[PDB]
Amino acid sequence: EDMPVERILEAELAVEPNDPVTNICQAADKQLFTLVEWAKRIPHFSELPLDDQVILLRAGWNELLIASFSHRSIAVKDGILLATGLHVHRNSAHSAGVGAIFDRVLTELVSKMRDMQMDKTELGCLRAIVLFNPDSKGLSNPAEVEALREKVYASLEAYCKHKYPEQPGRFAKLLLRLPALRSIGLKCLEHLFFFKLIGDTPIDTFLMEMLEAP
Amino acid sequence: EDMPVERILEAELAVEPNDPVTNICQAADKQLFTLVEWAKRIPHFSELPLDDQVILLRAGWNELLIASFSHRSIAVKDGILLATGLHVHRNSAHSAGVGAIFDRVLTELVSKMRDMQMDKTELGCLRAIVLFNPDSKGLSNPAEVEALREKVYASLEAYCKHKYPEQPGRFAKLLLRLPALRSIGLKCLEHLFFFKLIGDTPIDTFLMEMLEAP
Amino acid sequence: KHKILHRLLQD
Amino acid sequence: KHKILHRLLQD
Ligand SMILES: CC(=C/C=C/C(C)=C/C(=O)O)/C=C1\CCCc2c(C)cccc21
Numbered sequence: 001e002d003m004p005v006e007r008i009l010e011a012e013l014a015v016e017p018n019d020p021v022t023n024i025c026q027a028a029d030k031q032l033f034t035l036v037e038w039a040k041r042i043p044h045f046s047e048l049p050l051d052d053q054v055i056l057l058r059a060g061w062n063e064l065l066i067a068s069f070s071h072r073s074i075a076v077k078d079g080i081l082l083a084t085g086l087h088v089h090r091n092s093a094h095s096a097g098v099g100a101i102f103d104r105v106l107t108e109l110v111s112k113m114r115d116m117q118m119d120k121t122e123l124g125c126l127r128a129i130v131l132f133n134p135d136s137k138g139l140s141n142p143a144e145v146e147a148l149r150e151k152v153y154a155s156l157e158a159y160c161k162h163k164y165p166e167q168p169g170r171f172a173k174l175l176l177r178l179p180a181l182r183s184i185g186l187k188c189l190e191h192l193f194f195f196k197l198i199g200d201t202p203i204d205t206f207l208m209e210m211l212e213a214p
Numbered sequence: 215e216d217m218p219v220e221r222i223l224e225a226e227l228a229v230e231p232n233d234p235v236t237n238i239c240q241a242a243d244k245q246l247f248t249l250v251e252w253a254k255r256i257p258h259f260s261e262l263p264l265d266d267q268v269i270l271l272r273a274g275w276n277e278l279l280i281a282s283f284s285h286r287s288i289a290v291k292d293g294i295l296l297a298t299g300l301h302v303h304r305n306s307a308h309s310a311g312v313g314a315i316f317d318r319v320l321t322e323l324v325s326k327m328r329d330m331q332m333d334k335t336e337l338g339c340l341r342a343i344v345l346f347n348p349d350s351k352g353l354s355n356p357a358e359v360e361a362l363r364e365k366v367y368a369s370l371e372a373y374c375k376h377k378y379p380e381q382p383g384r385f386a387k388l389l390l391r392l393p394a395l396r397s398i399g400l401k402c403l404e405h406l407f408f409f410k411l412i413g414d415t416p417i418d419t420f421l422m423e424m425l426e427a428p
Numbered sequence: 429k430h431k432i433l434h435r436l437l438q439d
Numbered sequence: 440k441h442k443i444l445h446r447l448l449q450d
């Protein structure tokens with residue numbers, strides 16, 4: 001009852017116009033700052049208590065960033081476009097020892113988004129649904145977060161069916177990429193903790209903070 | 215165009231009327247046999263090539279079993295009911311060193327299913343969607359699997375809205391427990407591999423086979 | 429491989 | 440804890 005897809009699309013358009021791993025980590029740190037600005041532009045997020053805003057972002061940052069560069073990469077051959085303007089080719093990822101997870105991103109996310117021509121409004125809404133994760137531990141008022149999530153998917157469904165009336169299964173198709181996003185995000189986190197453990201690979205301050213306990 | 219929720223409900227009704235970890239693993243092995251019978255009763259599954267039937271089950275067995283005992287446990291205070299007729303209380307899980315994952319099952323799955331009164335038809339459909347996972351690696355014809363998944367969620371949506379017209383967001387709410395199911399299933403797998411590594415905890419033949427590589 | 433699963437699916 | 444995130448959210 002107050003979650004316009006126009007404000008969500010606006011949030012998306014407002015924040016976005018040699019070792020591939022090192023480049024990926026640098027891009028991630030860069031985008032973490034941008035992610036906070038994005039969240040603030042999502043309706044009602046800023047009205048939640050600071051502690052819950054922190055919880056939601058710490059809980060969803062990895063999936064939020066993955067969804068974003070994956071959609072940005074729909075126009076890329078076999079690779080991804082980093083927010084830094086750098087492209088990471090599949091062969092480069094493979095030659096760096098991270099080909100398996102890279103291939104999952106290309107196959108389960110990028111290719112699927114390109115195939116259904118997921119638009120920016122839809123991406124923004126899926127990210128907003130991820131942001132408003134009621135399962136996040138520590139939330140002072142999980143019911144409030146759940147309420148916001150419901151408002152987002154209610155608006156997204158309305159958007160679909162009205163924009164794509166001929167694709168009745170589109171709304172479900174969008175939501176069904178979330179389990180893949182959750183799995184891939186978890187794997188990417190594992191890689192990050194390993195990079196941090198090994199010592200090699202520079203990890204900037206905001207990215208490092210997100211890897212902080214809990 | 216040939217995925218009746220009645221056949222799915224039938225499949226569900228047809229297969230179901232001291233260390234808690236050991237009991238949980240024994241229940242899982244037991245249910246793996248039952249899972250194969252369930253799958254065969256899901257429309258069109260048996261018509262897929264044997265190699266793909268194997269792939270889909272090896273890829274989704276853990277989430278499929280978790281969804282099942284979680285729904286079975288909606289009537290339990292603070293714990294779960296195993297297919298063996300044994301109950302695992304939260305305190306028991308905690309005292310065995312597996313309280314964290316146990317609590318996630320209770321909070322993210324059981325409690326949520328109880329809160330929305332998820333019915334057996336809905337459970338069956340969600341499990342069928344999980345079964346028909348087009349992202350499964352090795353599939354000879356992923357498009358065919360994707361087609362079946364679409365038919366399942368198309369029928370589920372129809373079921374909802376018709377059975378629960380007053381809850382327009384129910385269909386989305388059901389699909390949105392899948393990311394939680396995916397995360398919890400992955401964690402449970404990790405625990406199983408550790409139990410297998412440590413040596414303690416008897417692991418039966420079918421469960422052991424599922425832990426086989428890949 | 430996967431002896432058990434194949435057998436149960438075939439039967 | 441989480442110095443950076445809090446600062447960016449507050450500003
Ligand atoms: C967590 C994450 C964030 C990505 C941020 C980026 C690259 C944002 C952007 O450029 O828009 C993705 C990672 C973390 C490091 C490991 C990794 C690999 C090996 C492949 C793909 C993604 C990721």
Ligand SMILES: CC(=C/C=C/C(C)=C/C(=O)O)/C=C1\CCCc2c(C)cccc21
Pocket residue numbers: 238239241242243245276279280282283295296297298312315316319402403405406
């Ligand atoms: C993978 C799995 C299967 C469960 C099967 C059961 C218990 C089926 C049933 O009883 O219906 C769940 C596990 C595996 C071992 C670790 C585990 C823990 C520690 C808690 C909850 C579930 C599980």
